[PDB]
Amino acid sequence: TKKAQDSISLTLTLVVKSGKYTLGTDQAIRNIRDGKAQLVFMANNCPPLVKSQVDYLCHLSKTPVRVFAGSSRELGIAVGRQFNVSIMTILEAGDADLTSI
RNA sequence: CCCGGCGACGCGCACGGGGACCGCGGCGGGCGGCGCCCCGGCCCGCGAACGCCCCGCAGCCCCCGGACGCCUUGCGCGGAGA
Ligand SMILES: [K+]
Ligand SMILES: [Mg+2]
């Protein structure tokens, strides 16, 4: 719990300082179908037709997909932006371990 | 047979575009009065519905691509993609 999230926070910052990533749904689809996505991270108010499609595309590519436990605004705050982020796709973990998940 | 659309819609200060009207100047034709002045006053110079081509701000949409910007008198908009 409390130990769990302070690792999720720690990893989410590690990628945005040293390691590639993209923010947004249209950038996330174009990468998953090409097999570049090590992880996919979604918000809990992600639109329901769009979420269904992201999971289907993920199982075909074997790309892991999790669910961040906050709104699309929290995800914006978490990776350090002033705008809402429905989907975050990590391309290279860099210095993050990604075991936190 | 079923599901829809057009017909089909309130009020308001402002801001913007089109048409008609209205003026000023030129130039073409005609008038008036004129003791002095007057290229200084007056009248007339017109183009429809409809058919074909082109051109149309705002506004909504497509493609690339992935962001400390775009923009109104006022605002407003953008990782749900500027
Ligand atoms: K009516
Ligand atoms: Mg009526």
UniProtKB/TrEMBL annotation:
<comment type="similarity">
    <text>Belongs to the eukaryotic ribosomal protein eL30 family.</text>
</comment>
<dbReference type="Pfam" id="PF01248">
    <property type="entry name" value="Ribosomal_L7Ae"/>
</dbReference>
<dbReference type="GO" id="GO:0003723">
    <property type="term" value="F:RNA binding"/>
</dbReference>
<dbReference type="InterPro" id="IPR039109">
    <property type="entry name" value="Ribosomal_eL30-like"/>
</dbReference>
<protein>
    <submittedName>
        <fullName>Ribosomal protein L30</fullName>
    </submittedName>
</protein>
<dbReference type="GO" id="GO:0003735">
    <property type="term" value="F:structural constituent of ribosome"/>
</dbReference>
<dbReference type="InterPro" id="IPR029064">
    <property type="entry name" value="Ribosomal_eL30-like_sf"/>
</dbReference>
<keyword id="KW-0687">Ribonucleoprotein</keyword>
<dbReference type="GO" id="GO:0022625">
    <property type="term" value="C:cytosolic large ribosomal subunit"/>
</dbReference>
<keyword id="KW-0689">Ribosomal protein</keyword>
<dbReference type="InterPro" id="IPR004038">
    <property type="entry name" value="Ribosomal_eL8/eL30/eS12/Gad45"/>
</dbReference>
